[PDB]
Amino acid sequence: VNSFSGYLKLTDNVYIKNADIVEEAKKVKPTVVVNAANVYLKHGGGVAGALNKATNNAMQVESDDYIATNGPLKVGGSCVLSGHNLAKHCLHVVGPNVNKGEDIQLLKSAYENFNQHEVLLAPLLSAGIFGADPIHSLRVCVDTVRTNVYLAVFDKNLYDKLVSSFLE
Ligand SMILES: CC(C)[C@H](Nc1ncnc2[nH]cc(C(=O)NC3CC3)c12)c1ccc2c(c1)S(=O)(=O)CCC2
Numbered sequence: 001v002n003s004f005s006g007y008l009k010l011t012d013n014v015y016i017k018n019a020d021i022v023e024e025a026k027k028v029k030p031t032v033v034v035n036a037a038n039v040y041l042k043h044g045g046g047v048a049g050a051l052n053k054a055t056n057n058a059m060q061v062e063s064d065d066y067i068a069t070n071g072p073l074k075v076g077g078s079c080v081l082s083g084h085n086l087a088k089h090c091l092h093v094v095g096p097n098v099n100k101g102e103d104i105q106l107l108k109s110a111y112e113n114f115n116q117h118e119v120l121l122a123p124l125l126s127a128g129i130f131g132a133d134p135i136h137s138l139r140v141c142v143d144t145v146r147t148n149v150y151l152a153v154f155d156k157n158l159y160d161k162l163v164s165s166f167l168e
Helices: 021-028 046-054 058-070 106-116 134-144 156-166
Strands: 014-017 032-036 078-082 089-093 119-122 148-152
Touching: 014 134, 014 156, 021 046, 021 119, 021 148, 032 046, 046 058, 058 078, 089 106, 106 134, 134 148, 134 156
Parallel strands: 014 148, 032 089, 032 119, 119 148
Antiparallel strands: 078 089
């Protein structure tokens, strides 16, 4: 139903909340939930692990069948698969992992995938153990995405830092 609540409005199309993306998906029932995926769709840790465990491993089983016949994605690319019990669809987006040496310029391409969907629930791409500067990831989101994006950031200190930095 795309019924989002409790978000701060940063721009006319970008919203942010201190929340777990899994709990937001259960409450909102969005048309699209974004996963911060890797190229072979191995959802072991972080955001991808939280989403997969909330589907009771259905997301990993579907992702393994997709990779067996289609092979890996590219950095900056995306794949629409089922959203299972969390959303109508899951948009698996691969942002660059700068801690593993990948190019930060590809973060723009990663966010450009969001423009194919009118409204999305999403994490902050390439943050956490992917190592991108989170303030820079928020700036790329704001400058690239034109559709309605609801960012769930599950860390109060990081949320407060992002909001303070944006309001400078
Ligand atoms: C910056 C984080 C606060 C954020 N995490 C989250 N953000 C929003 N809903 C979440 N639910 C569980 C989370 C989660 O990370 N759960 C683990 C047990 C810690 C979580 C996040 C944002 C983007 C990325 C990652 C992590 S990652 O997985 O480290 C690498 C991929 C990019």
